[PDB]
């Protein structure tokens, strides 16, 4: 038995165009611990993305935060791409400033 990641893509501060911010991808609720997370800008991988240290919840499931500096603009699209054993293909979640 294995548990599929929950995925949220969001900003550290409320998004404002032309203002520097952080883009976060929070993966949680998953087991086992191996997981591949990319942050995407206009469909292409962002380099040098950092992540928090592997921890887990009271139900034993793991969670990680992946994050990178970003300046949200009008045109630019942002996303999180996630792979886990529980997934047949990588799952892409688009960044929506209202979520």
């Amino acid at each position: 038995i294995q548990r599929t990641p929950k995925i949220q893509v969001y900003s550290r501060h409320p998004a404002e165009n032309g203002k520097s911010n952080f883009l976060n991808c929070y993966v949680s609720g998953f087991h086992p611990s191996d997981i591949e997370v990319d942050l995407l800008k206009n469909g292409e991988r962002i380099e040098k993305v950092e992540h928090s240290d592997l921890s887990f919840s009271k139900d034993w499931s793991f969670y990680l935060l992946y994050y990178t500096e970003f300046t949200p603009t009008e045109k630019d699209e942002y996303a999180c791409r996630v792979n886990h054993v529980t997934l047949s293909q990588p799952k892409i979640v688009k960044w929506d400033r209202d979520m």
Partner: protein, 276 residues
């Protein structure tokens, strides 16, 4: 308020890819203060909060030795778990441990924990009495017999009642500007039409610490549990957390709906409405 200290261990086998990786992270409440990773270039206990940097060289030496010893111990546990479940040596497995203590506002022990899991399932756990165990299966029962013979519970109890609470009280004092500060949520309700017929009301809470919070919607004073989309509380990256609750409401009925926020940084619960 009340406080906890926990250490989380993760030991992960990976046949064909070297020895099992062993990680430790320590938390006071929702603040990570210490980490160890056997995959690190030079494995050692590393500080992750300003207030722990206070501890002397002897603290860091002792803490590092524990984790280094643990790397080896947990490799042995993984081998043993394989035997106990008649599992082959080709597969990857995970042992986890959570342990620590909760204290009240006066710093007295509220309760202690020492809990283990294998492949994300309960394995063995120190009962709240700090003197007996709950084994989840016949494999864990083998471990239980061993630990009863070795009087492990007694020794855990001694740690939980003594050094666990003593160190947490010191940490609480050294990090009093942060660990003993609750940041209330900043809250608002957004309005997004979904169609001519329905609009989403989203109740946001941002900037709060600790992570514990309750966000609920009521319609005419009744809880909309079944019809509320509630995302998992998520980290902002600045120590604080975020959460929202969304409800889909009939067009024009927005004022029948109220958002309710409970958080320890608020002296009293908030009631929010859509403010057109």
């Amino acid at each position: 308020g009340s406080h906890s200290m926990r250490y989380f261990y993760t030991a992960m086998s990976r046949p064909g890819r070297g020895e099992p990786r062993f990680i430790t992270v320590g938390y006071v409440d929702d603040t990570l203060f210490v980490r160890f990773d056997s995959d690190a270039t030079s494995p050692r206990k590393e500080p992750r909060a300003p207030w722990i940097e206070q501890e002397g060289p002897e603290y860091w030496d002792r803490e590092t030795q524990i984790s280094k010893t643990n790397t080896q111990t947990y490799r042995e546990n993984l081998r043993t778990a394989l035997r106990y479940y008649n599992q082959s040596e080709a597969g990857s497995h995970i042992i986890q441990r959570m342990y620590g203590c909760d204290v009240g506002p006066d710093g007295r022990l509220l309760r202690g924990y020492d809990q283990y899991a294998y492949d994300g399932k309960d394995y063995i756990a120190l009962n709240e009495d700090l003197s007996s165990w709950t084994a989840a299966d016949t494999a864990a029962q083998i471990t239980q017999r061993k630990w009863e013979a070795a009087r492990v519970a007694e020794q855990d109890r001694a740690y939980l009642e003594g050094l666990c609470v003593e160190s947490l009280r010191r940490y609480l004092e050294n990090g009093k500007e942060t660990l003993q500060r609750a940041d209330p949520p900043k809250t608002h309700v957004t309005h997004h039409p979904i169609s001519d017929h329905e609009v989403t009301l989203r109740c946001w809470a941002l900037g709060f610490y600790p992570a514990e919070i309750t966000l609920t919607w009521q319609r005419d004073g009744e809880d909309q549990t079944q019809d509320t989309e509630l995302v998992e509380t998520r980290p902002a990256g600045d120590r604080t957390f975020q959460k929202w609750a969304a409800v889909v409401v009939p067009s024009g009925e927005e004022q029948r709906y109220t958002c309710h926020v409970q958080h320890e940084g608020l002296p009293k619960p908030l009631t929010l409405r859509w403010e057109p």
